[PDB]
Design a protein around this ligand. Structure first.
Ligand code: FDA
Ligand code: FDA
Ligand code: FDA
Ligand code: FDA
Ligand code: ORN
Ligand code: ORN
Ligand code: ORN
Lengths: 455, 451, 450, 451
């Protein structure tokens, strides 16, 4: 439970996006006000005026990548509450207990539930906050607010959102803003725009509408060699059984993701303090050394499955060029021909060896899945009408350790501010975009944003 | 947490033993009284008068088998509370959080903590009941009590215990008794008593006192082929590196324990209802069908290590009879000669099918456990049973049958941990303790807590 | 190995050309190779050998080449390695010849796909095409007396029916090997119907019955061993909108046991120890080791099937609503199948000492290994008087009355001797070593003279 | 069996070293001369005059690192013959069959034999070449020979070795030389030389002579975080149960070695052709991208074991600084005080980003160098093409020589030190079986074809 604020009142906090980062904040505030879990909150009566705006029509966790049988890449103990308080009612185990499913999950013997199940757990959590989440609202800008228009100090912010069904613009006033909008699809700048070129994030939701007949002999290419690329390549061979699929990667091979126990301690919540305090050179060097814990890597078991699928083809035909499904390593796409009335595009491939008697290959494909990752800079556009409130000379938003961005103290009241969530890897460590530290961080955020107010 | 009852007052419940079974009852009672876990408890004034008697000097979980590196045989999710309420403060995960170790345990990636750790967890739990647990008290009998002697109705029980340090006998009066005393060492009937013949349960605590010099080339035999035998045999080779150890088993081979997921559902808490209601013939048949889940089986990984160690010996010497450590299958012990001043006993071996001798400094007897010590403990109330029973018969709720004309309905005796035959293969393990503790709190204190 | 003209007196005739006989062909080849056996340089006389196989080409339980099915035994136990790793008929040399050895090395598995191990044995078998007559089903074995003045049987006539033409062919031999594997075991209570198909004919017969891979068929599977689990699992992929039901009289699928100490019962050198035990001892031993082979599923497939069921529970807590269901501790009491309805009605009762409407029932109830009894009925009078069963010696030669059968003639059994020779007899476990033993038993004296 | 050549004759081939690389060459020549394996070998009555010089007294494979329980890091299929011919009598599987051990190894279900076992397998191979291997001979230089008086062309080489027992210098003449001397111990340039500073390569042989009492509470430090460091650190805690061990590494963590299936194909024999023909810049980039397949990495299972042991210490005491065994990451050694009459050295630590210990010994597990052939060949380096400062092998491992200074019938080959031109597999067992066969063609092809 959290009771709603009338839309027109001045909010204490408005959060943009209701994915796992914002949801853990919602959960942490709930637990902070629960006197059974927090002996102090016995004397507390007033609840902060909180509001969440989410672009999707309901809570959903990367729905375009809910590939049948995909598993989480992280232990369920790192759910949205347990590392902060195992007694919380929002643990994965308590959710299973409520679904009457806990003993059955115990016999699974896995730390890595299906992505479908973990979505249901977080959907189960999120439903308990329906009175403070406005769905179908896409935030478009954040503009400065002044209670006295003749004042030179901004003391609140107006968040504007467009309803995804009507297009109507709504305005909500708040003292503090959290931006937790995840990542945007990153496409190679050389690729043209075309309904047959689909980022991995829209795989489950748009590809079936393009290629309607599940038995047709489509040619489908996949670009990339990380977890998204591997899952799409593996699934397409099951989803379209008569298809010819081609995995295109600029590396020489899929490489295994690293979560060996010592290396994995960089994701511990208490490391965030050490990481933040290092110099920019140390943080950059560290992120590069631990690259294989998260980016451009595939879970070993899935590498092993794809290799076995390829081995079976080799058993049937010693000639790799005749295989139904193929991996073309150390290639890059140099041209995509897509104009004209035909269904298929023509992809031109050259070696990915640095430009420093080469051969060019062509493919005709009905679709190209682009599994080339994500950017986390969409907040720059959302915050562009308040960036003049930054300190003189900053070209980028600067979060402190507590995730609040730096602002000119003469332009912004100390009672107003903006916080960033999920886009702070460079200052806060490889865990920032993941589920890794969300439970603990939600607690930190509730202290940071509401600590004085609750006390 | 739970406040004490004066020793001389009439108790609501007395529990004999403070192992995991009693600890689960204590925890569930705490949780039933916790307004965070039951809003239907914010309006509860009186805490029931509860008492626990434990013979050991502190909480301890088979400390004589705390073999270096030994692991749990069950997922940590089946702890003393989670399957009943994951919000409990007595979960394993919350314990880790209090110890500041939760994130580190996460990187272990295991469902099977070290036995040493799970002991500390339950010990951490047990400390919060220190005001209601009397340690160093060995219960010796349970005797019937009558508030009106002129009556034919037993309406309470007197539990007598001997202090392990002083020998003083104490008497406590209670309306209800729980017996949760675990198992006793099962010894083969043909073996004589000798300080060199030591049951597995006393391995860590007695053997080092006997074989003090860790460098001597002792001959040590081990009898059995279940989990206790496998762990002792493996550990002896590290503990006494120059020893010659011999594993003696009547089966042909160590066999893996079965916790494959469909088979493992017999341990689910909700199976207890189905199992309890089956006939005596069906109950026996299923326990025999599911034997490989618990008795006479070794965790697959431990077998593989032992086999690898033997394989390495074969690499060094192809003649098995010259090996330092040996496994002798399909053998039974027919005689042990032990009378004499000489240090070693002479073990005589025969085939286990329906001359070999070993001279040994010690024999570890890893032959399992019996669970009927309650029969001796309850013999002075045996006349209160319905006429014709030669055994104590627990109902589904674990309360034993008593002649309704001889025992008041407000008094009773419950059994815990010794009911495998009527309640399933999960009765003696950690499997259903969290849910079962909750059930017991309902059965014994439900009416009292509701009013 | 060079062929023998059909009409000549053979030294050895083998009935069946599956893995059991193939191991013999391979072992005889190696016994004659001077690279492997120095003495064979002084042998130019090859024994007169011939193989009769009922299938049109070599094939290894092809009605069960289920997509993704794996071997249940390490590739080291191929058809030659445990006898001689230098043999050209090893699995590793096959991979090397196919140019696949390093790629297989990167698979890091001891358990090849069944498809692959079948191709490995097919590669072996093709090198014996001159002594294998395919499409020939042996129908009887009949005694021969070469000396009209004696009553002593000193050879055998094996007659076979060609499966395509029906012509009956007769071949004379001094010694016979029967290595015809197993026959489908069906529960005695089940009626015959084209919709009731044993697991051995799953891949080959069911597709002809259920042609539309997308139709919402109800398909039941009976049993809980490796075949039941592989079919139950595959049907959910093969007919994705189907409703499948696994019917078992046990309470659960149970894991197969190949832990290292238990598994030593399959070692080649155990056969001597096993054979010499009493009948009661051998019977007790087979019962104690049942979980090594019968009524058991590889753990990984159990875990997989359980995971699929768990996903259904996530989607719907009501098991009775599931697309795919397991009904444990059940038995089939009646099958209603006479009628125009496309579906049969299966009647279920509890198996301790509800109905389904199904388009098909897969019967995964295992195999019998006694078909040799009918094949040998015209020589049964040659057994020692008082024996009601064929008795193999340790060397697999069946006992015969020395006053009725010349010592130069005899009959050997392969694959049907579990009760006398151990759990390894019907499997691949000891075939390479046993191939060697058979060549010594059958050709030892002849190869020495030669 | 290859027959020996008289010591004073002109050899066709002389090999420096008799480790696995040279042994694979010996095996491949044997197989090339076997008419059972190569049909042509029937019409060959001329065995090449071959000789091997090995400094150790008998075949031995990194005996200084035969840590109890250490395992191969490579599938046994990549033994010294199988990838070239599975029918060879020198396969690992055939060795097991000859030792009567094949079925027992099968029940192990592993591709990774114990290093102790794989050592014995290669020793079993090596015994069959005893007539052409001179043990106890340390090669010190290779000198050019001119058989034609007044000529300026080198057409043979003199290999000189010192007897390890007597110190006597022997001279052997050959037209072709193979250098296969493996790697030399790499020590950090800042550390001083002291009997207490011991490279990992001498762990099993030298540390026990230094720290003789296995029960004393030594402080033993280990430097590095690759496979050698991890095995020693792990072993020291078993070998010296009361010691205080400290792992010092400049990385932040031990990282797992990569042999996942697609990545691992860089080790396939046929990749050598692809790698060799790539540009110098492309080869350096590829070697950098695949580093985690071989250098500064630990087998995952071993990392997990070390992490488990540390977790247990955390269970016993939450204060990392009080643990018996400790890991100090992101440190480098800046100073060692060791000139003193006190038994312990003083190690000074600073951050390894761009504290003191007192220890009885420091194990330096800092890897290997492969450039000792430069010193062995220094008296023939004037024969390199003008302008080369380094030895350059062709694809077939023959080093380039000025065609006007060296007869085409003479030459020198390198084995194992050619990673920069031939791929990450060059120094390992990965391609030895195939490569030996290639070497037999390269060195003896014309000679065997004329025969
Ligand atoms: C397919 C896939 C699978 C995983 C992962 C990534 C991907 C692509 N991740 C990493 C992933 O970032 C993480 O699991 C969470 O989604 C991060 O939560 P955030 O709320 O910061 O992002 P996220 O993208 O989840 O949530 C942001 C939300 O904001 C909304 N939004 C965006 N713009 C808006 C606007 N203008 N107005 C209103 N709402 C807006 C979006 O609709 C979305 O709901 C992961 N990590 C891990 O530790 N373990 C794992 O197993 C995985 N699995
Ligand atoms: C070495 C070993 C290891 C395990 C297991 C057994 C053994 C021998 N078990 C099974 C084991 O029975 C179970 O884990 C618990 O110990 C069950 O606890 P109980 O409380 O029923 O008795 P348990 O034996 O624990 O404790 C009963 C207590 O009663 C006391 N007592 C006895 N008589 C008394 C008297 N007259 N007066 C006072 N006190 C008395 C004893 O001192 C003891 O503390 C197990 N199960 C599982 O599910 N997972 C696992 O990993 C294991 N591990
Ligand atoms: C699906 C499946 C999978 C396996 C296994 C069984 C099944 C059903 N087995 C056990 C199996 O029995 C063993 O692998 C071999 O098939 C035994 O070979 P046999 O040659 O003795 O019989 P098998 O059935 O192979 O061969 C007998 C042959 O005789 C022929 N035949 C029969 N009657 C004839 C006649 N009258 N005239 C002419 N020819 C006739 C048949 O056509 C057949 O080819 C196994 N074991 C193991 O160790 N590892 C494993 O992975 C497996 N896998
Ligand atoms: C502890 C350890 C363990 C392994 C490995 C390395 C180390 C340090 N390796 C890599 C290793 O390099 C490989 O196993 C082989 O030993 C390489 O064989 P070489 O014969 O080229 O050198 P190697 O060092 O084996 O042999 C060279 C020989 O030349 C001798 N020698 C040197 N100088 C001489 C001189 N001047 N005169 C005479 N003789 C001289 C030496 O005595 C030695 O015997 C490995 N790789 C892999 O693929 N799998 C694995 O499991 C392992 N395991
Ligand atoms: N002996 C240990 C058995 C534990 C049981 N498999 C369970 O899951 O409860
Ligand atoms: N059903 C297959 C059993 C094979 C047996 N484990 C063996 O190793 O021979
Ligand atoms: N250091 C050992 C590397 C061996 C290599 N992965 C291979 O498979 O050949």
């Amino acid at each position: 439970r959290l009771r709603s604020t009338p839309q027109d009142e001045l909010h204490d906090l408005l959060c943009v996006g209701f994915g796992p980062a914002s949801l853990a904040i919602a959960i942490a505030l709930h637990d902070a006000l629960d006197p059974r879990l927090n002996k102090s909150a016995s004397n507390i009566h007033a609840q902060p005026k909180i509001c969440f705006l989410e672009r999707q029509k309901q809570f959903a966790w990367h729905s375009g990548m809910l590939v049948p049988g995909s598993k989480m890449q992280i232990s369920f103990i790192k759910d949205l509450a347990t590392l902060r308080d195992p007694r919380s009612s929002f643990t994965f185990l308590n959710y299973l207990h409520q679904k009457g499913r806990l003993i059955h999950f115990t016999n699974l013997s896995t730390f890595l539930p299906a992505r479908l199940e973990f979505e249901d757990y977080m959907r189960w959590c999120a439903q308990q906050f329906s009175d403070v989440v406005a769905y179908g609202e896409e935030v478009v800008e954040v503009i400065p607010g002044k209670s006295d228009p003749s004042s030179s100090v901004v003391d609140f912010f107006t968040v504007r959102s467009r309803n995804v069904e009507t297009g109507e613009i709504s305005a909500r006033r708040t003292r503090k803003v959290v931006i937790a909008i995840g990542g945007t699809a990153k496409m190679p700048s050389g690729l043209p725009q075309d309904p047959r070129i689909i980022h991995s994030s829209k795989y489950c939701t748009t590809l079936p509408a393009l290629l309607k007949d599940k038995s047709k002999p489509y040619n489908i290419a996949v670009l990339g060699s990380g977890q998204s690329a591997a899952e799409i390549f593996h699934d397409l061979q099951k989803r379209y059984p008569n298809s010819r699929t081609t995995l295109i990667m600029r590396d020489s091979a899929m490489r295994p993701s690293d979560d060996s126990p010592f290396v994995n301690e960089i994701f511990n919540p208490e490391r965030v303090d050490k990481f933040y305090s290092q110099s920019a050179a140390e943080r950059q060097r560290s992120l590069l050394a631990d690259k294989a814990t998260n980016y451009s890597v595939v879970r070993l078991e899935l590498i092993e499955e794809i290799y076995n699928d390829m081995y079976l083809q080799r058993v049937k035909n010693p000639d790799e060029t005749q295989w139904q499904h193929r991996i073309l390593p150390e290639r890059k796409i140099t041209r995509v021909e897509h104009h004209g009335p035909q269904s298929r595009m023509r992809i031109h491939l050259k070696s990915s060896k640095p430009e420093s008697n080469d051969v060019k290959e062509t493919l005709e494909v009905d679709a190209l899945m682009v599994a080339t990752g994500y950017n986390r800079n969409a907040h720059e556009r959302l915050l562009s009408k308040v960036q003049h409130l930054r300190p003189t000379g900053q070209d980028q938003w600067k979060p402190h350790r507590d995730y609040r961005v730096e602002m000119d103290p003469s332009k912004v009241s100390s009672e107003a501010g903006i916080w960033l969530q999920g886009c702070n890897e460079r200052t806060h460590g490889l865990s920032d975009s993941l589920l890794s530290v969300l439970a603990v961080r939600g607690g930190e955020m509730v202290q940071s944003i509401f600590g004085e107010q609750l006390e």
